[PDB]
Amino acid sequence: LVKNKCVNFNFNGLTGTGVLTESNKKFLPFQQFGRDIADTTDAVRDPQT
Amino acid sequence: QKLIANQFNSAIGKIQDSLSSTASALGKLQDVVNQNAQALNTLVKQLS
Ligand SMILES: *[C@@H]1O[C@H](CO)[C@@H](O)[C@H](O)[C@H]1NC(C)=O
């Protein structure tokens, strides 16, 4: 895992391109995916950590 | 001259108060910004 740079990430089969950084969104234990107003993924929990 | 000056200054003061107040006479500009904003939101939401 790498942060702060453009990378072709793949999380649990979900693919996307972007810059990954720590997020302050306090996801509840059941929550796994955050979405913006455009229904596009903007936050996620890594399965290994 | 002096009376006209006083009236002019008082008018300017009342304009300042009216704009300073909660009045929203600026609605026309707000419409221009708001309409474009919601149009953008609609276009973005269409991707889903
Ligand atoms: C495996 O994944 C779990 C859950 O993210 C994590 O706690 C653990 O450190 C990972 N590695 C090993 C060797 O279990």
Curated annotation (Swiss-Prot), chain A:
Outcome, altering residue 15 to K: In strain: Omicron/BA.1
Its biological purpose: Attaches the virion to the cell membrane by interacting with host receptor, initiating the infection. The major receptor is host ACE2. When S2/S2' has been cleaved, binding to the receptor triggers direct fusion at the cell membrane. When S2/S2' has not been cleaved, binding to the receptor results in internalization of the virus by endocytosis using host TFRC and GRM2 and leading to fusion of the virion membrane with the host endosomal membrane. Alternatively, may use NRP1/NRP2 and integrin as entry receptors.
Subunit structure: Binds to host ACE2. RBD also interacts with the N-linked glycan on 'Asn-90' of ACE2. Cleavage of S generates a polybasic C-terminal sequence on S1 that binds to host Neuropilin-1 (NRP1) and Neuropilin-2 (NRP2) receptors. Interacts with host integrin alpha-5/beta-1 (ITGA5:ITGB1) and with ACE2 in complex with integrin alpha-5/beta-1 (ITGA5:ITGB1). May interact via cytoplasmic c-terminus with M protein. May interact (via N-terminus) with host bilirubin and biliverdin, thereby preventing antibody binding to the SARS-CoV-2 spike NTD via an allosteric mechanism.
Protein name in the entry: Spike protein S1
Swiss-Prot record, chain B:
Source taxon at top rank: Viruses
Chain intervals for the UniProt region annotation (Heptad repeat 1): 1-48
Known role: Subunit of the fusion protein that is processed upon entry into the host cell. Mediates fusion of the virion and cellular membranes by functioning as a class I viral fusion protein. Contains a viral fusion peptide that is unmasked after S2 cleavage. This cleavage can occur at the cell membrane by host TMPRSS2 or during endocytosis by host CSTL. In either case, this triggers an extensive and irreversible conformational change that leads to fusion of the viral envelope with the cellular cytoplasmic membrane, releasing viral genomic RNA into the host cell cytoplasm.
Name listed for the protein in its UniProt record: Spike protein S2'
Species of origin: Severe acute respiratory syndrome coronavirus 2 (2019-nCoV)
Gene name in the database record: S
